[PDB]
Structures are given as C-alpha cells and as structure tokens.
Design an enzyme around this catalytic site. Structure first.
Site, PDB file in Angstrom:
ATOM      1  N   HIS A 177      -0.585  24.109  12.815  1.00 19.80           N
ATOM      2  CA  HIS A 177      -0.050  25.465  12.735  1.00 19.80           C
ATOM      3  C   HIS A 177       0.092  25.954  11.298  1.00 19.80           C
ATOM      4  O   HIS A 177      -0.038  27.154  11.051  1.00 19.80           O
ATOM      5  CB  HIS A 177       1.220  25.666  13.565  1.00 19.80           C
ATOM      6  CG  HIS A 177       2.378  24.801  13.192  1.00 19.80           C
ATOM      7  ND1 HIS A 177       2.613  23.575  13.779  1.00 19.80           N
ATOM      8  CD2 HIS A 177       3.435  25.037  12.383  1.00 19.80           C
ATOM      9  CE1 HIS A 177       3.742  23.073  13.308  1.00 19.80           C
ATOM     10  NE2 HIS A 177       4.256  23.940  12.455  1.00 19.80           N
TER      11      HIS A 177
ATOM     12  N   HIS B  92       6.148  24.566   3.365  1.00 15.38           N
ATOM     13  CA  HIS B  92       4.968  25.100   4.015  1.00 15.38           C
ATOM     14  C   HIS B  92       4.984  26.611   3.841  1.00 15.38           C
ATOM     15  O   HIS B  92       5.955  27.189   3.346  1.00 15.38           O
ATOM     16  CB  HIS B  92       4.948  24.705   5.495  1.00 15.38           C
ATOM     17  CG  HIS B  92       6.113  25.272   6.244  1.00 15.38           C
ATOM     18  ND1 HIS B  92       7.330  24.635   6.327  1.00 15.38           N
ATOM     19  CD2 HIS B  92       6.282  26.482   6.835  1.00 15.38           C
ATOM     20  CE1 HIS B  92       8.187  25.418   6.973  1.00 15.38           C
ATOM     21  NE2 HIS B  92       7.575  26.548   7.290  1.00 15.38           N
TER      22      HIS B  92
ATOM     23  N   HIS C 180       3.678  30.564   5.778  1.00 14.06           N
ATOM     24  CA  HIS C 180       3.149  31.398   6.851  1.00 14.06           C
ATOM     25  C   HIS C 180       2.372  32.530   6.184  1.00 14.06           C
ATOM     26  O   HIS C 180       2.789  33.032   5.135  1.00 14.06           O
ATOM     27  CB  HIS C 180       4.281  31.971   7.724  1.00 14.06           C
ATOM     28  CG  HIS C 180       5.232  30.930   8.234  1.00 14.06           C
ATOM     29  ND1 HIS C 180       5.178  30.437   9.516  1.00 14.06           N
ATOM     30  CD2 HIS C 180       6.254  30.269   7.635  1.00 14.06           C
ATOM     31  CE1 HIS C 180       6.118  29.522   9.682  1.00 14.06           C
ATOM     32  NE2 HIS C 180       6.785  29.392   8.550  1.00 14.06           N
TER      33      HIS C 180
ATOM     34  N   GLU D  77       7.340  36.208   7.683  1.00 15.12           N
ATOM     35  CA  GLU D  77       8.185  36.123   8.867  1.00 15.12           C
ATOM     36  C   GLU D  77       9.387  37.047   8.712  1.00 15.12           C
ATOM     37  O   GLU D  77       9.587  37.962   9.516  1.00 15.12           O
ATOM     38  CB  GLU D  77       8.573  34.665   9.093  1.00 15.12           C
ATOM     39  CG  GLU D  77       7.332  33.825   9.409  1.00 15.12           C
ATOM     40  CD  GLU D  77       7.645  32.588  10.188  1.00 15.12           C
ATOM     41  OE1 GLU D  77       8.504  31.802   9.744  1.00 15.12           O
ATOM     42  OE2 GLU D  77       7.047  32.414  11.280  1.00 15.12           O
TER      43      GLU D  77
ATOM     44  N   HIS E 167       8.403  28.503   2.741  1.00 15.49           N
ATOM     45  CA  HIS E 167       9.630  27.912   3.262  1.00 15.49           C
ATOM     46  C   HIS E 167       9.800  26.513   2.687  1.00 15.49           C
ATOM     47  O   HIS E 167       8.983  25.621   2.959  1.00 15.49           O
ATOM     48  CB  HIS E 167       9.583  27.826   4.788  1.00 15.49           C
ATOM     49  CG  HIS E 167       9.665  29.155   5.427  1.00 15.49           C
ATOM     50  ND1 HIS E 167       9.252  29.400   6.722  1.00 15.49           N
ATOM     51  CD2 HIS E 167      10.130  30.325   4.931  1.00 15.49           C
ATOM     52  CE1 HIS E 167       9.468  30.676   6.991  1.00 15.49           C
ATOM     53  NE2 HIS E 167      10.012  31.250   5.931  1.00 15.49           N
TER      54      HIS E 167
ATOM     55  N   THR F   3      11.720  28.849  12.805  1.00 20.97           N
ATOM     56  CA  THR F   3      10.846  29.912  13.286  1.00 20.97           C
ATOM     57  C   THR F   3       9.672  29.393  14.101  1.00 20.97           C
ATOM     58  O   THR F   3       8.895  30.196  14.624  1.00 20.97           O
ATOM     59  CB  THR F   3      10.320  30.770  12.141  1.00 20.97           C
ATOM     60  OG1 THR F   3       9.396  29.972  11.405  1.00 20.97           O
ATOM     61  CG2 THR F   3      11.439  31.304  11.263  1.00 20.97           C
ATOM     62  N   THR F   4       9.539  28.080  14.219  1.00 25.03           N
ATOM     63  CA  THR F   4       8.534  27.444  15.052  1.00 25.03           C
ATOM     64  C   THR F   4       9.235  26.636  16.137  1.00 25.03           C
ATOM     65  O   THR F   4      10.336  26.124  15.911  1.00 25.03           O
ATOM     66  CB  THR F   4       7.662  26.484  14.226  1.00 25.03           C
ATOM     67  OG1 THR F   4       8.511  25.537  13.566  1.00 25.03           O
ATOM     68  CG2 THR F   4       6.843  27.252  13.207  1.00 25.03           C
TER      69      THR F   4
HETATM   70  N1  LIG Z   1       9.459  27.798   9.666  1.00 22.54           N
HETATM   71  S1  LIG Z   1      10.790  26.960   9.410  1.00 22.54           S
HETATM   72  O1  LIG Z   1      11.017  26.883   7.995  1.00 22.54           O
HETATM   73  O2  LIG Z   1      11.839  27.502  10.230  1.00 22.54           O
HETATM   74  C1  LIG Z   1      10.489  25.305   9.941  1.00 22.54           C
HETATM   75  C2  LIG Z   1       9.234  24.985  10.434  1.00 22.54           C
HETATM   76  C3  LIG Z   1       8.900  23.694  10.847  1.00 22.54           C
HETATM   77  C4  LIG Z   1       7.508  23.440  11.312  1.00 22.54           C
HETATM   78  O3  LIG Z   1       7.279  22.338  11.972  1.00 22.54           O
HETATM   79  O4  LIG Z   1       6.633  24.252  11.077  1.00 22.54           O
HETATM   80  C5  LIG Z   1       9.882  22.676  10.775  1.00 22.54           C
HETATM   81  N2  LIG Z   1       9.596  21.397  11.191  1.00 22.54           N
HETATM   82  C6  LIG Z   1      10.544  20.303  11.133  1.00 22.54           C
HETATM   83  C7  LIG Z   1      11.342  20.186  12.377  1.00 22.54           C
HETATM   84  C8  LIG Z   1      11.107  19.613  13.565  1.00 22.54           C
HETATM   85  C9  LIG Z   1      12.278  19.778  14.341  1.00 22.54           C
HETATM   86  C10 LIG Z   1      13.146  20.440  13.589  1.00 22.54           C
HETATM   87  O5  LIG Z   1      12.601  20.719  12.362  1.00 22.54           O
HETATM   88  C11 LIG Z   1      11.148  23.001  10.278  1.00 22.54           C
HETATM   89  C12 LIG Z   1      11.444  24.287   9.873  1.00 22.54           C
HETATM   90 CL1  LIG Z   1      13.059  24.619   9.318  1.00 22.54          CL
HETATM   91 HG   LIG Z   2       1.339  22.604  15.367  1.00 25.48          HG
HETATM   92 ZN   LIG Z   3       8.368  28.215   8.113  1.00 21.44          ZN
END
Ligand SMILES: NS(=O)(=O)c1cc(C(=O)O)c(NCc2ccco2)cc1Cl
Ligand SMILES: [Hg+2]
Ligand SMILES: [Zn+2]
Ligand code: NA
Length: 257
Positions: A61, A91, A93, A103, A116, A195-196
C-alpha cells in the site's frame, strides 16, 4: 484484501473494520479558522540525532522506512504529548497528480503528498501493546508540495527502483530523517486513528503547518511503484490516501498564534 481501488477502497473498509465509522477516525480536514491557539501546548521536541534506519519495504500500500526502536534513540516529546514516543517507521501517501495525495487537508486544500513519522509511547513497552491504548501512538504528519527538490528525500527516491513490487525490501541504513523536516515546527493537534486498516484509535496526530517542497521528479518516482507483487499485472501505487473523516466531538488545537 483492503486497498484503494473501487472494489476494496476506503468506502469498503468498514465491513472488515467497523471502527472505520468510529468516533475518532483520521484523517480530518483542518479548518484553520476554527482551530484554536492553545498556549498550554509546548514546543515539539524532535530528537532524531541518534536514529538508526534499517530497511525500506514495499508493503503493498505504501513503502515504510523502518528504524531500530529497541532502545531510546529517535524520539518525539513535548508538544501535546506526555512522556516519550519512539520512532518506528515513516511512510508517505501520495496522488496520481499533484492536486491530490494528502490525507489531512487544510481548509479543504489537498497537498501532493503527506509524510507520516510513526512513534509509539514507551510507557507501554512495545508497539503491539501501545496500539491497545488511546494514547499509544503519535504520528508527525508533514505535507509535501511540488516545487524545489528536497535534498534529504533523494536517497529515498533513488532506492525505490529496488522495491518496485509488494513484498520487496532493501537495506536502508544511515538515513537521517531530520532532512525531511520543514523549518518551522508549528503544528495542529487532535486525537485520531490509523488512516489504514486496522484503523485503530490510538493516535495523537501532530500535523505541521509548513509543508516541505519536493520536485516533480521526486514525486513522479513515488508514482512508479506498484501495489502488486512481482509477476502480477502492474497496478501503479498512486492515490493511496484515505479521504477526510467526520470530526465528530473533537477539537483541533494550534500551537501557534
Ligand atoms: N497512516 S498512519 O500513519 O495512520 C499508519 C499507517 C500504518 C500502515 O501500515 O500503513 C501503520 N502501521 C503500523 C500498525 C499496524 C497496526 C497498528 O499500527 C501505522 C500508522 Cl499510525
Ligand atoms: Hg498493504
Ligand atoms: Zn500514513
Ligand atoms: Na475549535
């Protein structure tokens, strides 16, 4: 599986992840005239001098640059936060064209991309425990606009050829995330979520007011990545952003007057 397309994109996520319709979902539109200055907010302390990046991964993603979070090295403190939050990954977006990709939005304005930097609260011991807490994570969000190149981004851009498809990774040591920051650390903050998927409601969002500039060539390289795995039909990794979600009973606070 969830993604960003017509059949599996943000409007579908609630079926597997019902919290998608929750009370503190992210991102949101930042209405600059309603976000109130809070003099009790502190300056953000970004301490990245000792960061140890390890690897860059195409996760299907986006791509993550991962850090050693086994000890206090790169940390975020201050601002709205109590205690210490360790950097685990960053990462982005981004969009298919420069007029979308972020976002968060600012008075409905969409930026070309959004960075982010994800941090977890060390009082919970590990990331997995932190994401069971309402104050488990802090994400520093930075908007990208297209203009002059960002020198500190070029090392990222130049490795993307080697992680084109889902599941590919590459060594990515000695990357300094200080080179991705704007001049000012003025920010907005509010309580939100990932946000994912799984969209967990764990995040103190800290969104910087000042965008960074990146060149058209830099963002064009992001858009050559693939959502698909090797040997599958090519689906360009573009428009991997969730739209703004309802603010509900939340306040966005500004660190600056
Ligand atoms: N897009 S985001 O910054 O909200 C975000 C995005 C991702 C992502 O996997 O893109 C992410 N993955 C780690 C994860 C797995 C379970 C909880 O946090 C964490 C965050 Cl905080
Ligand atoms: Hg993915
Ligand atoms: Zn993010
Ligand atoms: Na307000």
């Amino acid at each position: 599986h969830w993604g960003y397309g017509k059949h599996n994109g943000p409007e579908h996520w609630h079926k597997d992840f019902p919290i998608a319709k929750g009370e503190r979902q992210s991102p949101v539109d930042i209405d600059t005239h309603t976000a109130k200055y809070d003099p009790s907010l502190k300056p953000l302390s970004v301490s990245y001098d000792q960061a140890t990046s390890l690897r860059i991964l195409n996760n299907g993603h986006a791509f993550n640059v991962e850090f050693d979070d086994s000890q206090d090295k790169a940390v975020l403190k201050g601002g709205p936060l109590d205690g210490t939050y360790r950097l685990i990954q960053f990462h982005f977006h981004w969009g298919s064209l420069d007029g979308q990709g972020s976002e968060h939005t600012v008075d409905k304005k969409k930026y070309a991309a959004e960075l982010h930097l994800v941090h977890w609260n060390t009082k919970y011991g590990d990331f997995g425990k932190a994401v069971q807490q309402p104050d488990g994570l802090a994400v520093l969000g930075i908007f990208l606009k297209v203009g002059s190149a960002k020198p500190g981004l070029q090392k990222v851009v130049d490795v993307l050829d080697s992680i084109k498809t889902k599941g590919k990774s590459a060594d990515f040591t000695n990357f300094d995330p200080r080179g991705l920051l704007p001049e000012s650390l003025d920010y907005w903050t509010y309580p939100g979520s990932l946000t994912t998927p799984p969209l967990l409601e764990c995040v103190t969002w800290i969104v910087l007011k000042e965008p960074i500039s990146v060149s058209s060539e830099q963002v064009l390289k992001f858009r050559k990545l693939n959502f698909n795995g090797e040997g599958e039909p090519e689906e360009l990794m573009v428009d991997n952003w969730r739209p703004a979600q309802p603010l509900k009973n939340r306040q966005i606070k500004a660190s600056f007057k």
